[PDB]
Design an enzyme around this catalytic site. Structure first.
Site, PDB file in Angstrom:
ATOM      1  N   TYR B  90       0.826  -1.040  -0.061  1.00 52.20           N
ATOM      2  CA  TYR B  90       0.326  -0.140  -0.095  1.00 52.20           C
ATOM      3  C   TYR B  90       0.839   1.305  -0.140  1.00 52.20           C
ATOM      4  O   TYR B  90       0.270   2.340  -0.028  1.00 52.20           O
ATOM      5  CB  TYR B  90      -0.762   0.056   1.394  1.00 52.20           C
ATOM      6  CG  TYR B  90      -2.028  -0.921   1.322  1.00 52.20           C
ATOM      7  CD1 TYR B  90      -2.929  -1.261   0.286  1.00 52.20           C
ATOM      8  CD2 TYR B  90      -2.087  -1.951   2.396  1.00 52.20           C
ATOM      9  CE1 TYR B  90      -3.789  -1.976   0.288  1.00 52.20           C
ATOM     10  CE2 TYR B  90      -3.012  -2.934   2.488  1.00 52.20           C
ATOM     11  CZ  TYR B  90      -3.982  -3.282   1.507  1.00 52.20           C
ATOM     12  OH  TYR B  90      -4.838  -4.040   1.279  1.00 52.20           O
ATOM     13  N   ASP B 150      -0.619 -11.976   8.218  1.00 53.17           N
ATOM     14  CA  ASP B 150       0.327 -12.797   7.306  1.00 53.17           C
ATOM     15  C   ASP B 150       1.735 -12.640   7.666  1.00 53.17           C
ATOM     16  O   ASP B 150       2.541 -13.371   8.006  1.00 53.17           O
ATOM     17  CB  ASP B 150      -0.023 -12.724   5.880  1.00 53.17           C
ATOM     18  CG  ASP B 150      -0.917 -13.276   5.465  1.00 53.17           C
ATOM     19  OD1 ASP B 150      -1.896 -13.549   6.104  1.00 53.17           O
ATOM     20  OD2 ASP B 150      -1.201 -13.774   4.132  1.00 53.17           O
ATOM     21  N   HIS B 389       4.596  -6.511  -4.426  1.00 52.89           N
ATOM     22  CA  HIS B 389       3.212  -6.646  -4.615  1.00 52.89           C
ATOM     23  C   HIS B 389       2.466  -5.350  -4.317  1.00 52.89           C
ATOM     24  O   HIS B 389       3.083  -4.393  -3.888  1.00 52.89           O
ATOM     25  CB  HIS B 389       2.515  -7.461  -3.843  1.00 52.89           C
ATOM     26  CG  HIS B 389       2.571  -7.579  -2.302  1.00 52.89           C
ATOM     27  ND1 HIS B 389       1.729  -6.857  -1.712  1.00 52.89           N
ATOM     28  CD2 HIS B 389       3.301  -7.754  -1.512  1.00 52.89           C
ATOM     29  CE1 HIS B 389       1.711  -6.781  -0.277  1.00 52.89           C
ATOM     30  NE2 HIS B 389       2.881  -7.632  -0.072  1.00 52.89           N
ATOM     31  N   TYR B 470     -11.768  -1.646   0.653  1.00 52.91           N
ATOM     32  CA  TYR B 470     -11.484  -1.494   2.155  1.00 52.91           C
ATOM     33  C   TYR B 470     -10.320  -0.619   2.705  1.00 52.91           C
ATOM     34  O   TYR B 470     -10.364   0.068   3.541  1.00 52.91           O
ATOM     35  CB  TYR B 470     -11.650  -2.831   2.946  1.00 52.91           C
ATOM     36  CG  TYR B 470     -10.442  -3.420   3.472  1.00 52.91           C
ATOM     37  CD1 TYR B 470      -9.442  -4.335   2.682  1.00 52.91           C
ATOM     38  CD2 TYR B 470      -9.721  -3.167   4.799  1.00 52.91           C
ATOM     39  CE1 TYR B 470      -8.215  -4.919   3.080  1.00 52.91           C
ATOM     40  CE2 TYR B 470      -8.611  -3.710   5.355  1.00 52.91           C
ATOM     41  CZ  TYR B 470      -7.911  -4.657   4.454  1.00 52.91           C
ATOM     42  OH  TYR B 470      -6.614  -5.102   4.781  1.00 52.91           O
ATOM     43  N   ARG B 471      -9.417  -0.757   1.866  1.00 51.18           N
ATOM     44  CA  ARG B 471      -8.127  -0.147   2.043  1.00 51.18           C
ATOM     45  C   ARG B 471      -7.374   0.122   0.560  1.00 51.18           C
ATOM     46  O   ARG B 471      -7.740  -0.725  -0.486  1.00 51.18           O
ATOM     47  CB  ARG B 471      -7.086  -1.427   2.793  1.00 51.18           C
ATOM     48  CG  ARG B 471      -6.151  -0.865   3.769  1.00 51.18           C
ATOM     49  CD  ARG B 471      -5.534  -1.891   4.379  1.00 51.18           C
ATOM     50  NE  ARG B 471      -4.186  -1.762   5.056  1.00 51.18           N
ATOM     51  CZ  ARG B 471      -3.784  -2.586   6.058  1.00 51.18           C
ATOM     52  NH1 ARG B 471      -4.104  -3.789   5.987  1.00 51.18           N
ATOM     53  NH2 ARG B 471      -2.550  -2.020   6.225  1.00 51.18           N
TER      54      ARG B 471
HETATM   55  C1  LIG Z   1       2.999  -7.809   1.085  1.00 49.55           C
HETATM   56  C2  LIG Z   1       1.830  -8.325   2.236  1.00 49.55           C
HETATM   57  C3  LIG Z   1       1.518  -7.314   2.809  1.00 49.55           C
HETATM   58  C4  LIG Z   1       0.366  -7.530   4.025  1.00 49.55           C
HETATM   59  C5  LIG Z   1       0.198  -9.324   3.751  1.00 49.55           C
HETATM   60  C6  LIG Z   1       0.782 -10.023   3.126  1.00 49.55           C
HETATM   61  C7  LIG Z   1       1.679  -9.806   2.327  1.00 49.55           C
HETATM   62  C8  LIG Z   1       2.708 -10.710   1.845  1.00 49.55           C
HETATM   63  N1  LIG Z   1      -0.770  -9.690   4.992  1.00 49.55           N
HETATM   64  C9  LIG Z   1      -1.780  -8.773   5.545  1.00 49.55           C
HETATM   65  C10 LIG Z   1      -2.616  -9.386   6.560  1.00 49.55           C
HETATM   66  O1  LIG Z   1      -2.740 -10.506   6.630  1.00 49.55           O
HETATM   67  N2  LIG Z   1      -3.411  -8.293   7.103  1.00 49.55           N
HETATM   68  C11 LIG Z   1      -3.130  -7.137   6.990  1.00 49.55           C
HETATM   69  O2  LIG Z   1      -3.745  -6.108   7.646  1.00 49.55           O
HETATM   70  N3  LIG Z   1      -2.193  -6.491   6.257  1.00 49.55           N
HETATM   71  C12 LIG Z   1      -1.595  -7.358   5.471  1.00 49.55           C
HETATM   72  N4  LIG Z   1      -0.606  -6.938   4.584  1.00 49.55           N
HETATM   73  C13 LIG Z   1      -0.337  -5.386   4.538  1.00 49.55           C
HETATM   74  C14 LIG Z   1       0.648  -4.853   5.600  1.00 49.55           C
HETATM   75  O3  LIG Z   1       1.958  -5.539   5.626  1.00 49.55           O
HETATM   76  C15 LIG Z   1       0.354  -4.796   6.895  1.00 49.55           C
HETATM   77  O4  LIG Z   1      -1.059  -4.245   7.024  1.00 49.55           O
HETATM   78  C16 LIG Z   1       1.369  -4.004   8.046  1.00 49.55           C
HETATM   79  O5  LIG Z   1       1.299  -4.707   9.227  1.00 49.55           O
HETATM   80  C17 LIG Z   1       0.973  -2.723   8.026  1.00 49.55           C
HETATM   81  O6  LIG Z   1       2.493  -2.242   8.515  1.00 49.55           O
HETATM   82  P1  LIG Z   1       2.441  -1.401  10.016  1.00 49.55           P
HETATM   83  O7  LIG Z   1       1.891  -2.497  11.039  1.00 49.55           O
HETATM   84  O8  LIG Z   1       3.979  -1.184  10.136  1.00 49.55           O
HETATM   85  O9  LIG Z   1       1.714   0.084  10.058  1.00 49.55           O
HETATM   86  P2  LIG Z   1       2.670   1.462   9.344  1.00 49.55           P
HETATM   87  O10 LIG Z   1       3.238   1.321   8.076  1.00 49.55           O
HETATM   88  O11 LIG Z   1       3.247   1.804  10.427  1.00 49.55           O
HETATM   89  O12 LIG Z   1       1.320   2.526   9.145  1.00 49.55           O
HETATM   90  C18 LIG Z   1       0.260   2.026   8.741  1.00 49.55           C
HETATM   91  C19 LIG Z   1      -0.603   3.393   8.311  1.00 49.55           C
HETATM   92  O13 LIG Z   1      -1.451   3.632   9.467  1.00 49.55           O
HETATM   93  C20 LIG Z   1      -1.379   5.035   9.755  1.00 49.55           C
HETATM   94  N5  LIG Z   1      -0.542   5.205  10.843  1.00 49.55           N
HETATM   95  C21 LIG Z   1       0.341   4.488  11.363  1.00 49.55           C
HETATM   96  N6  LIG Z   1       0.836   4.948  12.471  1.00 49.55           N
HETATM   97  C22 LIG Z   1       0.102   6.044  12.893  1.00 49.55           C
HETATM   98  C23 LIG Z   1       0.349   6.933  13.999  1.00 49.55           C
HETATM   99  N7  LIG Z   1       1.075   6.821  14.952  1.00 49.55           N
HETATM  100  N8  LIG Z   1      -0.736   8.085  13.856  1.00 49.55           N
HETATM  101  C24 LIG Z   1      -1.479   8.190  12.713  1.00 49.55           C
HETATM  102  N9  LIG Z   1      -1.358   7.480  11.821  1.00 49.55           N
HETATM  103  C25 LIG Z   1      -0.709   6.246  11.981  1.00 49.55           C
HETATM  104  C26 LIG Z   1      -0.583   5.564   8.565  1.00 49.55           C
HETATM  105  O14 LIG Z   1      -1.401   6.137   7.487  1.00 49.55           O
HETATM  106  C27 LIG Z   1       0.260   4.484   8.098  1.00 49.55           C
HETATM  107  O15 LIG Z   1       0.451   4.329   6.608  1.00 49.55           O
HETATM  108  C1  LIG Z   2      -1.700  -5.782   1.288  1.00 56.06           C
HETATM  109  O1  LIG Z   2      -2.990  -5.970   1.385  1.00 56.06           O
HETATM  110  C2  LIG Z   2      -3.476  -7.076   2.290  1.00 56.06           C
HETATM  111  C3  LIG Z   2      -2.768  -8.233   1.862  1.00 56.06           C
HETATM  112  C4  LIG Z   2      -2.934  -9.465   2.588  1.00 56.06           C
HETATM  113  C5  LIG Z   2      -2.514 -10.751   2.379  1.00 56.06           C
HETATM  114  O2  LIG Z   2      -2.757 -11.786   3.044  1.00 56.06           O
HETATM  115  C6  LIG Z   2      -4.486  -9.291   3.552  1.00 56.06           C
HETATM  116  C7  LIG Z   2      -5.071  -8.131   3.679  1.00 56.06           C
HETATM  117  C8  LIG Z   2      -4.434  -6.988   3.201  1.00 56.06           C
HETATM  118  O3  LIG Z   2      -4.989  -5.656   2.926  1.00 56.06           O
END
Ligand SMILES: *Cc1cc2c(cc1C)nc1c(=O)[nH]c(=O)nc-1n2C[C@H](O)[C@H](O)[C@H](O)COP(=O)(O)OP(=O)(O)OC[C@H]1O[C@@H](n2cnc3c(N)ncnc32)[C@H](O)[C@@H]1O
Ligand SMILES: COc1cc(C=O)ccc1O
Ligand SMILES: *Cc1cc2c(cc1C)nc1c(=O)[nH]c(=O)nc-1n2C[C@H](O)[C@H](O)[C@H](O)COP(=O)(O)OP(=O)(O)OC[C@H]1O[C@@H](n2cnc3c(N)ncnc32)[C@H](O)[C@@H]1O
Ligand SMILES: COc1cc(C=O)ccc1O
Lengths: 525, 525
Positions: B90, B150, B389, B470-471
């Site tokens: 994302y 994941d 991705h 959703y996202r």
């Molecule tokens: C490549 C991929 C990605 C992935 C996944 C599987 C693969 C192979 N599976 C996922 C899953 O099972 N479920 C899910 O929700 N997401 C999945 N993804 C996408 C991604 O990897 C994860 O969501 C990841 O854990 C999110 O990254 P993180 O936890 O590090 O969050 P972040 O990058 O810091 O920020 C997310 C966004 O939220 C807002 N944000 C974050 N912190 C703040 C604060 N402190 N204040 C205000 N807003 C905040 C921002 O918009 C930020 O971009």
């Molecule tokens: C990168 O976005 C996503 C990836 C996954 C993968 O399992 C699940 C929820 C998500 O929003």
């Protein structure tokens, strides 16, 4: 004298009514002292009159809500929306700010729009009562159940919007709210969630949509007038069983709650929302106060004993309900009997076993917990003549010391002010809504002011102890919000900032939850 | 070519940087070309370079966050908060507005403030990863389990604030969120819920507090910087069992979803969040594309069938988990066998029954569904050289017909643009997240460009047909928000009026969720 809205003359107000009548028709605007007496708080608080509406307007559609809001913005007329206006215990239909116009959305906007059997939801306008919805579900042979409060004459929508509670596994109404349509304070209509996406069939299916999630901002709030709302409906399980456990001593509370928590946290074996009701609350549902005591002041402890004896109840009374396959119901009833058995004097009754006068509540809970609305709880208001109640509703941890502290704190002040303290702990996974219903004679000016003084003291005495209210009466809204004052009143300042930017002319339900628009701040109404 | 915030000069930027270092110390202010290299979107989308940070600031407390914000208001410098910045698929950590400063809250704000065993909750700063929390829980021999995605390298708070999802019964992360601390766009600090009441123990106990419930408005949002969040934690059940069902045919989808819905809608017998993954999703987790088809184009059916035959998997692959005492598991697996065994070719496996390579996904689901974080799904990026991705994630009704229509629609565009379609239907109560991962070579600039243009088509075609996301990726944020345009864009006008009240100077992650403050509106950014 004629109730007029703040800073609005007779001449400009009569112009304003005429325009409302243009929108809704002349039968659907009410404006005379006689007609308006029905919209006073049925359970008034304080000696001095307050919360007096200046008119009632009943729109037929969203399109009319919008035109009403526009008119109210052009003329400076504060508007105070309701659904069925049965918020009794918290002000009724009566508006916070005296002189507001009530928009009774429920009179004519009372259609059930959709009940979808496959996805287990309903889309409702705000006039749909729990009885209406129940009646629909019975007629159409439905496999769904609604979730209702103690009193089914209120609105599914209105109750949800004040974050009310019910007693099935779907008791937390706001959690299951899914999408809503709303007229914002300058007349624009908005849909939340997936309803913002044109042509979506997911409006009642996925609550959040995309981007910030705003639905909670329209609960306990004066940020708009809601015209449609969706809500998930649970499937009716194959069988159920309600039970009562009675507990003899007042001091049993601590142990009751500590035993409860590890059984509730996982939604099994306590699947529903248990309720722990004290004897004044259960007695009051089946009997008048003069049957047990006719002297002055707090009911003596011998009279408390007669209530427990005749009705065969405890000081504390735990009511719960189990659901599912009959072998599951019995496993779970078994676990519950084992845990609460520890408390000396605990006695167990299922809904099959008890059918006497004291059992009238168990029978009532078993209806409510199976989503069958009731009015049996109206009998509470015959505890004393001209009976009325107020809700003092602090939140408590699921911890017996916290609950015992709150109980003693409340009782100390209820005796000081000569009010009977009916108590109902409503028990979630991780917290308890501690509803303290003080029942009192509405005719007597001194009873009402003692109620107001007494509750102002408890709000402040509760806050000083770290306790806050989840919901409160018109008359206590400023006092309650004044307690949520972390970081120098940060929460209120935030709310007032949003209010001012959505409602530049300070039109919608001013004072609701202590949130006033720029033009009323500082005036003390 | 040195990146700068819009309309800010090299010297005005230099002075701001210097002020940031005063607040946080020297070590924690990155600004040099290849220090910031690591904060580019790791899976870039488009041939042109977008989403470039000008600096990164890692504060250690709430106070430093407030000061950083005040300094950014002074200079008109955009701030883009992240937690751990692992939002890959994302945008990763990269900002939506090129020139913004990343505020990586989690680098030093990574304390587990509390884990309470009694009430089953945690209080967390943004820097707690799912690994860190799992390690706390293992160390303390806890009764609780977390809910992870994941990839567990992300933050509990970051994921929750993007309304992310995991696969235990607590999968819907935002609903188990309880209480938060936030820095608002001009540096004021605010606690939500019972946290607004000084000395409450109930912050992580009752989410709503009193008056308007705002927590939802800080998710997919640019209204503040979150510094603390509470979340509820499920009790670990006494035993568990995971299972795979394989469906041989690509056409079985419709029938799999229609059978699924009644078994899921009451959280029993499908208790956890089931996933339906296609052969592509599962192959890439265990293998490279070149094992099955060395070739520029889309994968021929004979290569599809070898994948299935070698890995002993179906085109559609269903992964679920059961929890409870062993009798209940046997009961519920029983019913799941009998329901999905109506579909021809459908074969069942439990976690004990498979050690082959195709089964490594089941073993990875059995960890995740039991709150054991993991990084095995990283192997997915091998599929092609320099794998990245992007996520196109439409919401679907849990209906078989609607799930085939989204599937074909997406597959057609996948083939037209030469990108492989990996699909995972994440199944809630009344809705599905239909997550489409398109894996590509991030080094080839034509492939990066095919991706951006393809997903742009997909967003527009999905909304024409009644489906929203959703996202989404930075790249698609404006385009997704344009699809939710019911009422002449009533939703976006709302979010902007709120944005502009709380943030008069346009400081916090502008453009997030397609929401731009006044000073950036109607511009090509
Ligand atoms: C490549 C991929 C990605 C992935 C996944 C599987 C693969 C192979 N599976 C996922 C899953 O099972 N479920 C899910 O929700 N997401 C999945 N993804 C996408 C991604 O990897 C994860 O969501 C990841 O854990 C999110 O990254 P993180 O936890 O590090 O969050 P972040 O990058 O810091 O920020 C997310 C966004 O939220 C807002 N944000 C974050 N912190 C703040 C604060 N402190 N204040 C205000 N807003 C905040 C921002 O918009 C930020 O971009
Ligand atoms: C990168 O976005 C996503 C990836 C996954 C993968 O399992 C699940 C929820 C998500 O929003
Ligand atoms: C006396 C009493 C009260 C009571 C109870 C038992 C007794 C003996 N048991 C209750 C229970 O188990 N659960 C519960 O939630 N409440 C209980 N009460 C209190 C009350 O009577 C009920 O909650 C009742 O359902 C509320 O009245 P109603 O359902 O009619 O709601 P309303 O008066 O129309 O509206 C409530 C407030 O919400 C806002 N509102 C309502 N409609 C709108 C629209 N359309 N737009 C914007 N805001 C709206 C208003 O603030 C309104 O005052
Ligand atoms: C006075 O308001 C309430 C009453 C009750 C039950 O009698 C439950 C919750 C409430 O908020």
């Amino acid at each position: 004298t004629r109730t007029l809205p703040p800073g609005v003359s007779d001449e400009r107000f009569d112009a304003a009514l005429q325009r409302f009548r243009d929108v809704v028709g002349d039968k659907w605007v009410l404006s005379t002292a006689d007609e308006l007496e029905a919209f006073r708080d049925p359970y008034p608080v304080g000696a001095a009159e307050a919360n007096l509406p200046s008119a009632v307007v009943s729109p037929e559609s969203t399109e009319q809500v919008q035109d009403i809001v526009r008119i109210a913005n052009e003329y400076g007329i504060p508007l105070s929306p309701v659904s069925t206006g049965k918020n009794n215990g918290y002000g009724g239909a009566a508006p916070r700010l005296s002189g507001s116009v009530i928009v009774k959305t429920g009179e004519r906007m009372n259609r059930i729009l959709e009940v979808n059997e496959k996805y287990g939801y309903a889309l409702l306008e705000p006039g749909v009562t729990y009885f209406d919805l129940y009646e629909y579900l019975q007629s159409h042979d439905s496999g769904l159940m609604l979730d209702c409060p103690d009193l089914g004459w209120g609105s599914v929508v209105g109750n949800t919007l004040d974050r009310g509670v019910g007693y099935t596994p779907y008791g937390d109404h706001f959690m299951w709210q899914t999408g809503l349509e709303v007229v914002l304070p300058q007349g624009e209509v908005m849909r939340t969630g997936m309803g913002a996406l044109p042509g979506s069939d997911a409006w009642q299916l996925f609550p959040y949509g995309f981007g910030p999630f705003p639905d909670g901002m329209f609960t306990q709030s004066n940020l708009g007038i809601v015209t449609k709302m969706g809500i998930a409906l649970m499937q009716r399980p194959p069988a159920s069983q309600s039970f009562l456990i009675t507990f003899d001593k007042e001091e049993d509370l601590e142990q009751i709650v500590d035993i409860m928590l590890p059984l509730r946290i996982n939604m099994a074996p306590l699947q529903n929302v248990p309720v722990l009701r004290n004897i004044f609350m259960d007695a009051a549902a089946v009997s008048k106060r003069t049957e047990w005591f006719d002297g002055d002041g707090p009911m003596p402890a011998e009279a408390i004993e007669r209530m427990k004896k005749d009705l065969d109840l405890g000081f504390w009374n735990f009511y719960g309900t189990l659901y599912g396959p009959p072998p599951l119901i019995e496993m779970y009833y078994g676990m519950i009997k084992e845990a609460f058995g520890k408390i000396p004097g605990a006695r167990f009754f299922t809904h099959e076993e008890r059918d006497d006068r004291g059992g009238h509540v168990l029978q009532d809970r078993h209806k409510i917990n199976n989503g069958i609305p009731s009015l049996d709880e109206l009998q509470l208001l015959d505890w004393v003549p001209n009976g009325g109640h107020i809700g003092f509703s602090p939140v408590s941890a699921p911890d017996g010391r916290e609950a015992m502290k709150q109980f003693e704190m409340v009782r100390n002040r209820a005796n000081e002010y000569n009010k009977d303290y009916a108590a109902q702990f409503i028990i979630g996974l991780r917290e308890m809504h501690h509803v303290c219903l003080f029942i009192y004679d509405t005719a007597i000016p001194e009873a009402r002011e003692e109620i107001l003084q007494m509750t102002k003291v408890l709000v402040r005495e509760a806050a000083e102890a770290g306790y806050g209210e989840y919901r409160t009466h018109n008359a206590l809204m400023d006092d309650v919000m004044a307690t949520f004052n972390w970081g120098d009143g940060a929460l209120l300042k935030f709310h007032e900032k949003i209010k001012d930017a959505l409602d530049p002319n300070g039109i919608i339900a001013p004072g609701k939850s202590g949130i006033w628009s720029q033009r009323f701040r500082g005036q003390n109404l």
